[PDB]
Structures are given as C-alpha cells and as structure tokens.
C-alpha cells in the first residue's frame, strides 16, 4: 500500500512514500 507511478528522469517508474521507496517492477 502507498505505492505509485510517477517519472524519474523520463521513464515511469514505481513509486511509494509511505515506506520511502522506488522502483520500475514489483519483487
């Protein structure tokens, strides 16, 4: 939960604040 969807640097990628987290893909 918390998880989202946003750009970085031009790719959207994975994102989330409620853990402090970020990535492109889930585990």
């Given at each position: 939960p918390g998880w989202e969807i946003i750009?970085?640097?031009?790719?959207?990628l994975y994102y989330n604040a409620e853990q402090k987290t970020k990535l492109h893909y889930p585990p």
């Open positions: 750009h970085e640097n031009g790719r959207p």
